CSV table of C-alpha atoms and ligand atoms in Angstrom, one decimal:
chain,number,residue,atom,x,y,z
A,1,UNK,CA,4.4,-21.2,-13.9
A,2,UNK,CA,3.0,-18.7,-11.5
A,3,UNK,CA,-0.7,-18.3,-10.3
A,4,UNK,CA,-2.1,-14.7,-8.9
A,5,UNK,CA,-4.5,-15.8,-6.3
A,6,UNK,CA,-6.9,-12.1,-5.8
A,7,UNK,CA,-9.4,-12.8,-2.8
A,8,UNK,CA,-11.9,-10.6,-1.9
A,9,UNK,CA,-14.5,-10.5,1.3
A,10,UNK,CA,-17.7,-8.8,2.3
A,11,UNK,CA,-20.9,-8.3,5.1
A,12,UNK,CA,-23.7,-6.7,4.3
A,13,UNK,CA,-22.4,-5.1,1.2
A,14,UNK,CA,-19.1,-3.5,2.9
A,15,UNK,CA,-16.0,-4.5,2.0
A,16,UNK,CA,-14.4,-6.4,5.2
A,17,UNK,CA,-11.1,-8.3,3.4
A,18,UNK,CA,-8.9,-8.6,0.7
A,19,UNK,CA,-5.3,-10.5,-0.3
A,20,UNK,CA,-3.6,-11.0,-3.2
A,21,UNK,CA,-1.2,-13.8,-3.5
A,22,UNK,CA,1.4,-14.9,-6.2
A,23,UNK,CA,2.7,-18.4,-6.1
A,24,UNK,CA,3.9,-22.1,-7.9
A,25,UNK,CA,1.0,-24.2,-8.7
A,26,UNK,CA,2.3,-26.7,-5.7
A,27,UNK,CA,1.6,-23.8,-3.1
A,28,UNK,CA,-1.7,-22.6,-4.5
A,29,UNK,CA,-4.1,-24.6,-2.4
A,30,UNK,CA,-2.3,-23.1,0.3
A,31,UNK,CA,-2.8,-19.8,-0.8
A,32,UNK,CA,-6.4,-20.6,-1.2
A,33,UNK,CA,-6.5,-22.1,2.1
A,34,UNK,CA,-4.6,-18.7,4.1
A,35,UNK,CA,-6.6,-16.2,1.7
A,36,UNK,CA,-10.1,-18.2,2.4
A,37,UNK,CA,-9.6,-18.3,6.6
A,38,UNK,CA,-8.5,-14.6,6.7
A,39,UNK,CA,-11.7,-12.6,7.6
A,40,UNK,CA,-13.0,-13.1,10.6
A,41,UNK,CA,-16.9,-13.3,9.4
A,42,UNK,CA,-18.1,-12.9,5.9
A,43,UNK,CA,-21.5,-12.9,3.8
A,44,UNK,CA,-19.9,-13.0,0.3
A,45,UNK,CA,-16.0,-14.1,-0.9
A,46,UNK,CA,-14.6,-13.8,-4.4
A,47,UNK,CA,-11.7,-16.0,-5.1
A,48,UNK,CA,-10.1,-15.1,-8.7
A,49,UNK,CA,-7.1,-17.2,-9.3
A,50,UNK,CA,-5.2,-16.4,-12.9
A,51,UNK,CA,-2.3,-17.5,-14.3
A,52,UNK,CA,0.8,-15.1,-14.6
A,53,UNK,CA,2.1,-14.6,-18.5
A,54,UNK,CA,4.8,-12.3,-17.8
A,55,UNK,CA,6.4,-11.5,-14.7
A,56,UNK,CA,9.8,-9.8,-12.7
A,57,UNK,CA,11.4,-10.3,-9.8
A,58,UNK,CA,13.2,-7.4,-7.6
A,59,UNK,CA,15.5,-7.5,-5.1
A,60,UNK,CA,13.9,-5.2,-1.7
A,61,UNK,CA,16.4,-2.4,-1.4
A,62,UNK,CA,14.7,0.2,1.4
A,63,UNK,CA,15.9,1.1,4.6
A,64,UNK,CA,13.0,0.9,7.3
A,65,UNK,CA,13.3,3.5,10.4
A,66,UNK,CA,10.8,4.1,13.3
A,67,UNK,CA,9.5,7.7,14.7
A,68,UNK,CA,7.2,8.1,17.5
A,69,UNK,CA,5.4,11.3,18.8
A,70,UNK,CA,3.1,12.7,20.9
A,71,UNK,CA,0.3,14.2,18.7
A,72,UNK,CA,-0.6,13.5,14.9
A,73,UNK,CA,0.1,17.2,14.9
A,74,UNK,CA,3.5,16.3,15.3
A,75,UNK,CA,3.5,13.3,13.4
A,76,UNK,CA,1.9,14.9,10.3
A,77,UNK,CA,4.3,17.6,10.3
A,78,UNK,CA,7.4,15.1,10.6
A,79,UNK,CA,6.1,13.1,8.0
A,80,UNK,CA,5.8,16.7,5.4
A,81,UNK,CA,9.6,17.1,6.5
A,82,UNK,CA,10.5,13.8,5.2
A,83,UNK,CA,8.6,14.1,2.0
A,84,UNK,CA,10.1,17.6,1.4
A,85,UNK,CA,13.5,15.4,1.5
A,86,UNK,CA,12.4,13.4,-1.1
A,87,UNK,CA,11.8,16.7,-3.2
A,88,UNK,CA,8.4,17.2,-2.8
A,89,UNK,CA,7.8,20.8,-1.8
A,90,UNK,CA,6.5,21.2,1.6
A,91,UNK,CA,3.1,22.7,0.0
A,92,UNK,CA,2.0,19.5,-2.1
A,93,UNK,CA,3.0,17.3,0.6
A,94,UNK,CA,0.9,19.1,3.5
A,95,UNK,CA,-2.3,19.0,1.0
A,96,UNK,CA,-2.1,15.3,0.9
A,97,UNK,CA,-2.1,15.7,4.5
A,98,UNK,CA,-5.5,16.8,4.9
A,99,UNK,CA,-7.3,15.5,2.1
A,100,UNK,CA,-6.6,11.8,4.1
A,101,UNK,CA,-7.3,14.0,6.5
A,102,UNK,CA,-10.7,15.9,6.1
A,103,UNK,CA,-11.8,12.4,4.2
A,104,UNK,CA,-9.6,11.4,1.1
A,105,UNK,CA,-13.4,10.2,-1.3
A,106,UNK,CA,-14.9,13.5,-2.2
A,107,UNK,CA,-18.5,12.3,-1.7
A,108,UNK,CA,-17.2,11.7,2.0
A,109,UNK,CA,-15.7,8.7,3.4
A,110,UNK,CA,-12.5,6.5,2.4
A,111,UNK,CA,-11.5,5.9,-1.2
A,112,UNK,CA,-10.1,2.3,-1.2
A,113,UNK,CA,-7.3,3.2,-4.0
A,114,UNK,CA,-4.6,5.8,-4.1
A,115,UNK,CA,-5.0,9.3,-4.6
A,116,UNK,CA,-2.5,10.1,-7.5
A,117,UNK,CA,-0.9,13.8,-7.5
A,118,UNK,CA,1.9,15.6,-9.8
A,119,UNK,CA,4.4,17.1,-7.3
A,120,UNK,CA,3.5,20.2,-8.6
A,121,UNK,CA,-0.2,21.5,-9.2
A,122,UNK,CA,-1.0,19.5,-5.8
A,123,UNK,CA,-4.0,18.1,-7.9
A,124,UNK,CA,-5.7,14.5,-7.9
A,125,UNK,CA,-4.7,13.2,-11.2
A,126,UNK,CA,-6.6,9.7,-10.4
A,127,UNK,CA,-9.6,8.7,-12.6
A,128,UNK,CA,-12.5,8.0,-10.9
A,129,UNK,CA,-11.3,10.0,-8.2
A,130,UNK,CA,-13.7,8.1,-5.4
A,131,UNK,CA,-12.1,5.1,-6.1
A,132,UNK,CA,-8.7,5.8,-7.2
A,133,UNK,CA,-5.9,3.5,-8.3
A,134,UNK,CA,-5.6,-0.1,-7.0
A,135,UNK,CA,-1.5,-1.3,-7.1
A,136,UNK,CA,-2.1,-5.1,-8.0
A,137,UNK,CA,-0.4,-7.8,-9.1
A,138,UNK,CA,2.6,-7.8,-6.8
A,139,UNK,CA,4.0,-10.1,-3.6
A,140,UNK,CA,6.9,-11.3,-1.6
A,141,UNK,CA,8.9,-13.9,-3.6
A,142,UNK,CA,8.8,-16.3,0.0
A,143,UNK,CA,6.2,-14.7,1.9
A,144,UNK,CA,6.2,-17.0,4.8
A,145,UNK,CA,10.4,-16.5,5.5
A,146,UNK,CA,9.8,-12.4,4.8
A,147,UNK,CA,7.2,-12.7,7.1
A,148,UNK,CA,9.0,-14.8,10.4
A,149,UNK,CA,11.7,-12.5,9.3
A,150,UNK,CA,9.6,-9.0,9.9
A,151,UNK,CA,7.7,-10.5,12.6
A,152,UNK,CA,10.7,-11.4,14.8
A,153,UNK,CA,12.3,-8.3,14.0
A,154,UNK,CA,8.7,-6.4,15.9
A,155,UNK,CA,7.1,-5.4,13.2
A,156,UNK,CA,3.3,-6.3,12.3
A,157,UNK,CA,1.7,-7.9,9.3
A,158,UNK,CA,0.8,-4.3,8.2
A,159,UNK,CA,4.1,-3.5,7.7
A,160,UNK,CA,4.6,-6.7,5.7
A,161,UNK,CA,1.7,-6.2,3.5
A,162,UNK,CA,2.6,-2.2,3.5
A,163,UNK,CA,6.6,-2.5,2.7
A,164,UNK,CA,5.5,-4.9,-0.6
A,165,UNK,CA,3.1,-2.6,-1.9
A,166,UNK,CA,5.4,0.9,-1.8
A,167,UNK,CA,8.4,-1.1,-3.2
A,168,UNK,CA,6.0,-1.8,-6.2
A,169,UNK,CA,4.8,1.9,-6.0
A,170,UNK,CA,8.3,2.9,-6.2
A,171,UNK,CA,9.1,0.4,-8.5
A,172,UNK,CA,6.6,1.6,-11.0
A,173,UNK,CA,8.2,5.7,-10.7
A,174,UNK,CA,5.6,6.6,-8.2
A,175,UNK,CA,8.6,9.1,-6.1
A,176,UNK,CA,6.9,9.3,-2.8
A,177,UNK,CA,4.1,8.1,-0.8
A,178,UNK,CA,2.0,9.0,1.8
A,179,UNK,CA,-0.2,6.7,4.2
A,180,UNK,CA,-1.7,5.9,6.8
A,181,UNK,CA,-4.7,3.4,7.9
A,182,UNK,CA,-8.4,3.7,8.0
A,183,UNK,CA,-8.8,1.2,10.4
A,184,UNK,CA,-9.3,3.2,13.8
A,185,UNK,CA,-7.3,1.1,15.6
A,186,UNK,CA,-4.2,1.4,14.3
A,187,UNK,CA,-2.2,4.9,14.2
A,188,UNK,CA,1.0,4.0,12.3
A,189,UNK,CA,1.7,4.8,9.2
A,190,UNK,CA,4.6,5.9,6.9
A,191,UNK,CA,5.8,8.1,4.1
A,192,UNK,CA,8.1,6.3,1.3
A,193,UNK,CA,10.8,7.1,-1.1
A,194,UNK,CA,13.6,6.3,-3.1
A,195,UNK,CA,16.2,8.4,-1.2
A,196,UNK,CA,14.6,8.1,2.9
A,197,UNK,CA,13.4,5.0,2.3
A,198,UNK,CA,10.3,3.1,4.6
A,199,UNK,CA,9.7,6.0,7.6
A,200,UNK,CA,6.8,4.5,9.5
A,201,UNK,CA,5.2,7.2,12.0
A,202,UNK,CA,3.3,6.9,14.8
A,203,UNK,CA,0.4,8.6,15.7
A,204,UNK,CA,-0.7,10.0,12.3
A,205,UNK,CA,-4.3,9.9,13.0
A,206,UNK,CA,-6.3,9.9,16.4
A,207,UNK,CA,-7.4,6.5,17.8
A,208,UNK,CA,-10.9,6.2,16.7
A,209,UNK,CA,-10.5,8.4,13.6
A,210,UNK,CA,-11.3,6.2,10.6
A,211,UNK,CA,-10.5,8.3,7.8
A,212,UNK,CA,-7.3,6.8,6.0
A,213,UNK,CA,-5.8,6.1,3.0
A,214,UNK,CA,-2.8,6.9,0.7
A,215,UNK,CA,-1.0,9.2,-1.8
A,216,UNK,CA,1.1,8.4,-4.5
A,217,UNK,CA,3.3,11.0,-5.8
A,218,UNK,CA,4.0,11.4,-9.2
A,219,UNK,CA,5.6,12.8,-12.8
A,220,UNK,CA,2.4,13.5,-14.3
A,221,UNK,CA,4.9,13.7,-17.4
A,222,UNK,CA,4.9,10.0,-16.6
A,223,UNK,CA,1.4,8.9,-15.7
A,224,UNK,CA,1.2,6.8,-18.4
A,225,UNK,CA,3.2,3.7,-18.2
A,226,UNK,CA,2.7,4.3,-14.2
A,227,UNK,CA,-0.5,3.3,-13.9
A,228,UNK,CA,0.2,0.8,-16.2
A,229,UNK,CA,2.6,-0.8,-14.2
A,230,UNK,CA,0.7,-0.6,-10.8
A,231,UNK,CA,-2.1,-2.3,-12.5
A,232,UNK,CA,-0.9,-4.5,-14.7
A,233,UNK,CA,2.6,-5.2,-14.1
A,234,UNK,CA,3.2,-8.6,-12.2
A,235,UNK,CA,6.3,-8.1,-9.3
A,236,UNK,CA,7.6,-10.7,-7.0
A,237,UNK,CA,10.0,-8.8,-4.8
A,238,UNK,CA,12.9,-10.8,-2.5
A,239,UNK,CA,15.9,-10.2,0.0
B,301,PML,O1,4.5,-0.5,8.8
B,301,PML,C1,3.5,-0.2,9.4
B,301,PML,O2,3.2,-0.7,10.6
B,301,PML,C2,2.6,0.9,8.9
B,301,PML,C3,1.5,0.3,7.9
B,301,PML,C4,0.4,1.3,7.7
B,301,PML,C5,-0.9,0.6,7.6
B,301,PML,C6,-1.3,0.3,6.2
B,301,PML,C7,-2.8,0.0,6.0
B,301,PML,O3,-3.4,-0.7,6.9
B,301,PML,O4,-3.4,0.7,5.1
């Protein structure tokens, strides 16, 4: 008997906040409680809490590493290497590059889901292409010990809420992904896959830049039941 709980926040009209959580019925106040405190300052909060039919749990299987460099020039570039070793050919990877880049929504600004692409025609496969897909319905089986765990270990609750969402990516045949924040604050990002696992990068965007976003990779031979299961496919994902 699980419950998605799916909060999201606003001020004046912009998006500020946003959380999904997946729980027992004897933890869902407290996922109400964590989800309701988490903005700083809101106008406007939905809270839509729904009960899971059908559901699978995964065991997390993806190495994490760490690069640092001096430039997002340098960063960029490292992260189309990695890519390229996850079979993407170096000339689809560096156009995701710049579409996050030059501004990921073609009417300007961030899209606030994915950018799908075929690793082939280097082409945005998404639907409404200035919103993109949203991967949903997914969470750590025992968020709170995953968390301490991460935490302790130095990384940030980004990468807690970022590793859970490309293991579902992945999960659901997306190959590879490329990411990085829109939040101008905060220059890490990472490229995923299957093969070099969780590669978080640092600086892949200039402080004060706030143009991010992310990339899914994909077998547009397989777009089907992949968007399916990103948005509709319920995950809990453990140790
Ligand atoms: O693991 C990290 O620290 C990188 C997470 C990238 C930020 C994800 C986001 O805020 O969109």
């Amino acid at each position: 008997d699980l419950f998605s709980v799916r909060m999201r926040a606003q001020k004046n009209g912009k998006h500020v906040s946003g959380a999904e959580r997946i729980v027992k019925k004897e933890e869902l106040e407290t996922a109400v409680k964590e989800l309701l405190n988490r903005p700083k300052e809101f106008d406007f909060m939905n809270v839509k809490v729904e009960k899971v039919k059908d559901f699978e749990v995964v065991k997390f299987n993806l190495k994490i590493s760490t690069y640092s460099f001096k430039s997002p020039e340098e960063a960029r570039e490292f992260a189309v290497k990695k890519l390229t070793q996850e079979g993407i050919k170096e000339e689809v990877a560096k156009k995701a590059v710049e579409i996050l880049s030059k501004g990921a929504n073609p009417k300007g600004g961030n899209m606030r889901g994915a950018v799908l692409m075929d690793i082939e025609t280097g082409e945005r496969l998404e639907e409404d292409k200035e919103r993109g897909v949203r991967t949903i319905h997914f969470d750590w089986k025992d968020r709170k010990k995953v968390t301490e765990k991460l935490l302790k270990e130095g990384y940030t609750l980004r990468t807690v809420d970022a590793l859970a969402l490309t293991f579902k990516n992945l999960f659901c045949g997306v190959v590879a992904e490329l990411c990085w924040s829109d939040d101008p604050d905060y220059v890490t990002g990472y490229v995923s896959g299957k093969e070099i696992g969780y590669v978080r990068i640092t600086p892949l965007k200039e402080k004060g830049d706030p143009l991010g976003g992310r990339v899914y990779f994909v077998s547009r031979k397989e777009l089907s039941e992949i968007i399916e299961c990103l948005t509709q496919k319920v995950v809990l994902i453990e140790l």
